[PDB]
A paper describes a structure:
To gain insights into the molecular mechanisms that govern the metalloreductase activity of STEAP proteins, we determine structures of human STEAP4 using single-particle cryo-EM. The trimeric structures reveal an aligned, inter-subunit NADPH-FAD-heme arrangement and suggest that chelated iron(III) binds in a cavity of basic residues to facilitate reduction. Our biochemical and structural characterization of human STEAP4 elucidated that detergent-solubilized STEAP4 forms trimers that exhibit ferric-reductase activity in the presence of its redox cofactors, FAD and heme, and electron donor, NADPH, indicating that the enzyme does not require specific accessory proteins for catalysis. The trimeric arrangement observed in the cryo-EM structures is formed by interactions in STEAP protomers in both the OxRD and TMD layers, with a phospholipid molecule packed in between the TMDs of adjacent enzyme subunits, indicating that lipids stabilize the trimer.
Numbering used by the authors:
A (entry chain C), B (entry chain A), C (entry chain B): 19 to 454
Write the structure that this text describes.
Amino acid sequence: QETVCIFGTGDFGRSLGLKMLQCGYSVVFGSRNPQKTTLLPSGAEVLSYSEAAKKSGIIIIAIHREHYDFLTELTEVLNGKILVDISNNLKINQYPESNAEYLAHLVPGAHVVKAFNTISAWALQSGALDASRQVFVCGNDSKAKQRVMDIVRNLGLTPMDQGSLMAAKEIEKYPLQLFPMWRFPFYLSAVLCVFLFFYCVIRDVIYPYVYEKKDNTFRMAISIPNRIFPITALTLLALVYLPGVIAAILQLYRGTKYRRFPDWLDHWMLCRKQLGLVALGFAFLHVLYTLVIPIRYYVRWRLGNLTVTQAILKKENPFSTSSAWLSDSYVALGILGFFLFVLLGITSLPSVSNAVNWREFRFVQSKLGYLTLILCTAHTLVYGGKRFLSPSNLRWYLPAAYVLGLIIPCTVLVIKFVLIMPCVDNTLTRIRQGWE
Amino acid sequence: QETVCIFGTGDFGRSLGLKMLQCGYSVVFGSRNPQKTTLLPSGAEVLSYSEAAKKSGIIIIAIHREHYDFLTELTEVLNGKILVDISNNLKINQYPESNAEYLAHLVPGAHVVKAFNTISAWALQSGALDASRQVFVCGNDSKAKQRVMDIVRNLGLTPMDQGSLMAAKEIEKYPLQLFPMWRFPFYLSAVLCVFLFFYCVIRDVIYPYVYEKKDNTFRMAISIPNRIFPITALTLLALVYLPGVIAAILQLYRGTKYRRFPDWLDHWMLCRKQLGLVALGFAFLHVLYTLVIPIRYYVRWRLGNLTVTQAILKKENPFSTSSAWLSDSYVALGILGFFLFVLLGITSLPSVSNAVNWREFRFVQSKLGYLTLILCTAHTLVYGGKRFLSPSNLRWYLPAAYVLGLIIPCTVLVIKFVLIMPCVDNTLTRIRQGWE
Amino acid sequence: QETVCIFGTGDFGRSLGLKMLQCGYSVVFGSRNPQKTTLLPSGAEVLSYSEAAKKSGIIIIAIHREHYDFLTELTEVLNGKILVDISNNLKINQYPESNAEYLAHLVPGAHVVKAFNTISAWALQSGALDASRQVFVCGNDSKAKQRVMDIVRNLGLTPMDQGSLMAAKEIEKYPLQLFPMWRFPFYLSAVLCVFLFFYCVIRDVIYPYVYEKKDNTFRMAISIPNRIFPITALTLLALVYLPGVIAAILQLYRGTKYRRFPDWLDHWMLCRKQLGLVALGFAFLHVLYTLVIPIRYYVRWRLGNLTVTQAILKKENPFSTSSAWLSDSYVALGILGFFLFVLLGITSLPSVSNAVNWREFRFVQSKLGYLTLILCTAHTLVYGGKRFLSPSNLRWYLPAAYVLGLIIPCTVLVIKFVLIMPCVDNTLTRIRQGWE
Ligand SMILES: Cc1cc2nc3c(=O)[nH]c(=O)nc-3n(C[C@H](O)[C@H](O)[C@H](O)COP(=O)(O)OP(=O)(O)OC[C@H]3O[C@@H](n4cnc5c(N)ncnc54)[C@H](O)[C@@H]3O)c2cc1C
Ligand SMILES: Cc1cc2nc3c(=O)[nH]c(=O)nc-3n(C[C@H](O)[C@H](O)[C@H](O)COP(=O)(O)OP(=O)(O)OC[C@H]3O[C@@H](n4cnc5c(N)ncnc54)[C@H](O)[C@@H]3O)c2cc1C
Ligand SMILES: Cc1cc2nc3c(=O)[nH]c(=O)nc-3n(C[C@H](O)[C@H](O)[C@H](O)COP(=O)(O)OP(=O)(O)OC[C@H]3O[C@@H](n4cnc5c(N)ncnc54)[C@H](O)[C@@H]3O)c2cc1C
Ligand SMILES: NC(=O)c1ccc[n+]([C@@H]2O[C@H](COP(=O)([O-])OP(=O)(O)OC[C@H]3O[C@@H](n4cnc5c(N)ncnc54)[C@H](OP(=O)(O)O)[C@@H]3O)[C@@H](O)[C@H]2O)c1
Ligand SMILES: NC(=O)c1ccc[n+]([C@@H]2O[C@H](COP(=O)([O-])OP(=O)(O)OC[C@H]3O[C@@H](n4cnc5c(N)ncnc54)[C@H](OP(=O)(O)O)[C@@H]3O)[C@@H](O)[C@H]2O)c1
Ligand SMILES: NC(=O)c1ccc[n+]([C@@H]2O[C@H](COP(=O)([O-])OP(=O)(O)OC[C@H]3O[C@@H](n4cnc5c(N)ncnc54)[C@H](OP(=O)(O)O)[C@@H]3O)[C@@H](O)[C@H]2O)c1
Ligand code: HEM
Ligand code: HEM
Ligand code: HEM
Ligand SMILES: CCCCCC(=O)OC[C@H](COP(=O)(O)O)OC(=O)CCCCC
Ligand SMILES: CCCCCC(=O)OC[C@H](COP(=O)(O)O)OC(=O)CCCCC
Ligand SMILES: CCCCCC(=O)OC[C@H](COP(=O)(O)O)OC(=O)CCCCC
Ligand SMILES: *[C@@H]1O[C@H](CO)[C@@H](O)[C@H](O)[C@H]1NC(C)=O
Ligand SMILES: *[C@@H]1O[C@H](CO)[C@@H](O)[C@H](O)[C@H]1NC(C)=O
Ligand SMILES: *[C@@H]1O[C@H](CO)[C@@H](O)[C@H](O)[C@H]1NC(C)=O
């Protein structure tokens, strides 16, 4: 039966130690005081640091980085042992090297393996290990690394091997972050949903209060967020396919592809997935606010008054078939534009993305990605055809609030249309392999 | 070229043997009667048990557990061989030890590897291996276990290593179950959709038949299941976040977190995912029944009569703006409450759940999980404001059937609000690390 | 520090070489002209072919298959080296053996490992490696194959081991295909959406133009694709469960299950997933076109005229409760039939499909798959009950265009109902294990 020593009897020391007694391991704890040990599992004795290290070959140090000082006092006991470093830091970039690098320079005669820092101490105890299922294992000694990965499999976890000990810097960065790539689409969308809220409140509830004095302030429940949410979804969709256009222009002037993107475009290349899925989250709200139009009281009342007024005044509507074209056209373009929008979101799942090679992925994400941005722009051009862009449409001196949201998507489609023409695109094909 | 012996020429023996002839293996079957062999592949000879075992090093026993008796008669031939045990049982907990444990005690001088019990014999033959793609491999000998995993890769399958031979008890439990965790949310929801069907039939089709005698029995097609399905979705959502409240209370009285939950709460901790996804399945039905309201005949007729009666009787509706607030408010709260409801369901996918550490998962599942249960409770409080809870709302002595569904969600939100206050929550922070 | 030689300084040679300088490898390029080397990374010298191969043990040949001729001129240098073959072909089935097989016959004294052909040269450079994350590694020498997989882990990629070198034929087929299994459901659906477009244009816009001359040509925006898309979704759903019925008939005549399906049924067995997900894509369009009915101008106008005409002509509608049954029945059957339709699509995800054994998968995909095809057929039978199949329903001599779409689903449900009866099904149970 295997023996696993655990330095430190703290929170994660008890939780990892009690998980190993349930899987058939003889755990020998090591603490500063083996005399007074109140909370400990049943079949696990507690010894000194030098005494417990003489019993196993795998030593898990469940201590913080600041108290790594005593390991130099017993470096002749730790010769040939497997020291599993599990520690995290309180914040990113607190120390220059990682902990497993620093633990290797303290005890040079021992094989250091980074593991177990992703999982939490409560997930081992309660058994509610759902996102803390994978354990990232990295180390230099390949024989010692396969032995630690056998413990992770016997504890019901899934070891993901991360290579050599150089990858321990990124593993300690992993449990500290809270959506690091989603920060720029959240901040861009929040400053675009606040500006476009104050832009529609000034048009729809303030302008009918100054002129033609009426309350009209219920609009900011559904009727104003059904203008914020599609225009935010259309703008953020156009901000997705804009770096691929700016980078295509920036390669034509340079004449080569082997130079580096200018450090603001490169960070905005990597947030396209994050900008795309936030734009799907707002387009999905625009669908739900639109499909619930005929349930609202204002829509039932307005269609109720318009029918009664037509009933007592014997004038009639002669069914203009031109307006039946437009109202069935922009609704149809919005449905095809949302079907492909969802289809880009299905492919964004990390299991669907791995069952797809880079040609099938480029066909969905780029060929059917502009075709989303064409249909979602034609959905709001044909909707703009009913309003005609007349001078009776701007309230003070500021227009109908969707034509501001057509500046970025119609800019992307014009510049992309230049890059499709063979006087330019045949140069791009010769530049994706190398050119002067 | 490799040689793989297969004991037993039955259903899975032919299916696994014919799959290995298509991948470049020389398969030697072993049966009780090598003389009469009718159904067999082409390039695979059939020998005796002792004769076929002298030709390979990997022996796959395609026999049941009851006929393991003959292997003790030839235990001197099986020395050093790799015996791959593939057997299942007819029911869970039929024998005390697993089959691979029992196969190791019969032949102690052989390395036993559990594999191939997850896949079916038809999925190897027809090639329709879709859920039977992963093959769970476990065994003590690490050199013999990597050799069996090389066969699984060459057969187009994906070996998932499960550790030592102690994990063979759970692998044999795997192909027998049929949604074992989903049993409690299915039985709770079925006894809550049956009671709430008879509660709405008594109010909506029986009470208009006794008093004011009219048929009114078409309601149980859409109009009654649009009352069952949201209240079942709201109750099951409140039953998700109720164990996290009961466990928080039960840690304050104990003063420590290291004691065990009382065996009914612990089984209801593990079914939160299962209760949550069933509650999303009923909320998704409540969306589809609601968005199809203006297509129904009863809604078109009632809005048709109410307009014609207002047309021939010249009284008018003066557009009460107060009721335009409420009807745009509970509809908006239902959309935000369903958007985050879906967002919890996207994170529940086992590929999205693994691309997310436990802080980003706790932010979605708990911070944005109560915020779902707040918005979905405020969606049905504001809907209850239109009905005012007047005494003309209860039919015999029993109320309007959604206020029964507000008992559990408003209980969770009150007790959670006590646990947020810093006179209690600062004790919870000191108790998630250890306290007296 | 490790040394990795790369033959060939081309497009993928620079991209893979610059990725390895960023991970702590000393890369030594090999080219035909080490004198003139313009584009190259900083810390990577360029030598001759025989000179650079004498410095490392891992040699990555970044050259095409046609220029493999020079490796026979230096086969005494490549003894014991690990030659990583990364090449692709311009088209499928261009050469009889794969490249890694052909590279092994050129240099017999070297271990050949196929890797890196899935990823692209731009994904290494730009860092936008999203679908080119997995690297398929296969080779005969297990010690050399684990060494190449350590490079793939250190480059931030994920090595998927594919077994021996026999699997290199399928890995070179992998980056060339563009949805190979989706071709038959795309071509079947396109020839069924074109025929059913011309069938509804002849009924709905040509027949009201010849008789009772009116424009009526706006129908082909929403109103005609809301007839194409559900009938295509219902037909393709019936074409899913039809091979399982034809194969069940074809096993009863044969009397055994061990014979081979006749090569058109076998290719249509494998496209059931592909036919099923395309049928979900059209049913999801039928939902979105249907839920947007009360927003269209034609529906608002027609319900506006029908109310005003009822307001000025004092006749009334007495609320036939029979038509309130039917219109709430087929709408309810369409919602239950679409809920299970989506539930089959959630299980089709390759992460949900792997978290499910073959009994839970057969319960969803087959037991709840016919129950989808029953409810979606009863959704269009009850919708056909409102139209009664009168002789005033066919326009010239051709019927109401959904009853053509009931031929295939009602054929499958009748023949499946024969196979459920125990005079037939007890023979199928005795034939799924072997019978004469
Ligand atoms: C809902 C949604 C989900 C999304 N999910 C994802 C996701 O999961 N992952 C993701 O990455 N994006 C995602 N996106 C973003 C979008 O799909 C990407 O932009 C897409 O992958 C490529 O778009 P592109 O037009 O910029 O093409 P790109 O190829 O990225 O950009 C074109 C330019 O890139 C350069 N380039 C491209 N290929 C090469 C080459 N072989 N050699 C040299 N230069 C080259 C050239 O300069 C070319 O002009 C998503 C978007 C949405 C709306
Ligand atoms: C649609 C949907 C999908 C869902 N999917 C999932 C899913 O995939 N997986 C899943 O697990 N749940 C899932 N849930 C359930 C829900 O998300 C969980 O309850 C959530 O993970 C945590 O909720 P909670 O408030 O109970 O928090 P919890 O943290 O589970 O409960 C709080 C209590 O737990 C204890 N506790 C928590 N953390 C610690 C700690 N570090 N140390 C000590 N004690 C601690 C304390 O007693 C604390 O008061 C889903 C729910 C829905 C509605
Ligand atoms: C939205 C959607 C998604 C889908 N996704 C998938 C998917 O991911 N993967 C997929 O495979 N299909 C998928 N399908 C197709 C459908 O689910 C399959 O047909 C289903 O897996 C089985 O259906 P079946 O009735 O043909 O059953 P089958 O079992 O495939 O066919 C029955 C016949 O198969 C033979 N047979 C079955 N089991 C055995 C056995 N043990 N021994 C001998 N003979 C046997 C017998 O002849 C039997 O009569 C999908 C369909 C839809 C609509
Ligand atoms: N959820 C988690 O707790 C979690 C999760 C992931 C990773 N980790 C990591 O696991 C390790 C355990 O930390 P923890 O959170 O569980 O807290 P902790 O173990 O309770 O406190 C740190 C441990 O250091 C030991 N130690 C030895 N000398 C010490 C000294 N001079 N001063 C203070 N302590 C000394 C202590 O045990 P003795 O005095 O008895 O010897 C003490 O148990 C940490 O590195 C942590 O980053 C924890
Ligand atoms: N879909 C599947 O079939 C499937 C799936 C997963 C796992 N398995 C497992 O694979 C194994 C094969 O079982 P099976 O379903 O395919 O049925 P089976 O093989 O047809 O019957 C059991 C086999 O035991 C052999 N055997 C040897 N001595 C025997 C004896 N005294 N009495 C009876 N049989 C004897 C028989 O072959 P000979 O008499 O010719 O030697 C017979 O082929 C089982 O353990 C099963 O749990 C099967
Ligand atoms: N996106 C990709 O580029 C990609 C992706 C996956 C796989 N691959 C594979 O990686 C390999 C590299 O090809 P590549 O696309 O990057 O084009 P390439 O390397 O620019 O051209 C082929 C290479 O062959 C070398 N070579 C040696 N003798 C040659 C000769 N007589 N004639 C022509 N070339 C000779 C050349 O380098 P020197 O003359 O300087 O020695 C040249 O760099 C290919 O096998 C490719 O299938 C490429
Ligand atoms: C289910 C599919 C969709 C339907 C039925 C739909 C329908 C509509 C309708 C009816 C309007 C007019 C709103 C009103 O009456 O005030 C509208 C506006 C709009 N839609 Fe959509 N839409 C859909 C999807 C999309 C998508 C995917 C986008 C792109 C992100 C989009 C962008 C817009 C924009 C920009 C407006 C104008 C916003 C305004 O100024 O009011 N829609 N949509
Ligand atoms: C798309 C989003 C949603 C919309 C538009 C919506 C709309 C509505 C409407 C209009 C009603 C009144 C039904 C009627 O007219 O008889 C209602 C009732 C209700 N909704 Fe929602 N809802 C949504 C999502 C949700 C969610 C996510 C929940 C929580 C599970 C929920 C819980 C309820 C409850 C409990 C009722 C009262 C049931 C009754 O007694 O009739 N809804 N909803
Ligand atoms: C959200 C769920 C669904 C709803 C509310 C729904 C509703 C309807 C409605 C109202 C119609 C009549 C269309 C019209 O007024 O012209 C219809 C037609 C039809 N539906 Fe559905 N449906 C649903 C899902 C499905 C599904 C999943 C299928 C099967 C693929 C299906 C198959 C059909 C067929 C075949 C027709 C007849 C097409 C025609 O001739 O017009 N539906 N549906
Ligand atoms: C508050 C927003 C939280 C959203 C969390 C989330 O969904 O992202 C988790 C992860 C994304 O994480 P990273 O790509 O690693 O940033 O999974 C997905 O790819 C999303 C696919 C979803 C496709 C439908
Ligand atoms: C009759 C109900 C059958 C449902 C089957 C199912 O969906 O669960 C399969 C599995 C769940 O299986 P377990 O978590 O292992 O119980 O995948 C999911 O996590 C669901 C995610 C779904 C998120 C949208
Ligand atoms: C133009 C159509 C492109 C569609 C691409 C696609 O979705 O398939 C990618 C892959 C399917 O690829 P293969 O099964 O390998 O053919 O993932 C899925 O299983 C789909 C699950 C989706 C379940 C919702
Ligand atoms: C209603 O429609 C009919 C034909 O569809 C038309 O003749 C009649 O004038 C309309 N009634 C109105 C517009 O009041
Ligand atoms: C219809 O609305 C107008 C203003 O919107 C109002 O003046 C008129 O009284 C309404 N007609 C009714 C209530 O019949
Ligand atoms: C409207 O409905 C009432 C009862 O709901 C009925 O008595 C009345 O006749 C209807 N008005 C019509 C049909 O014009």
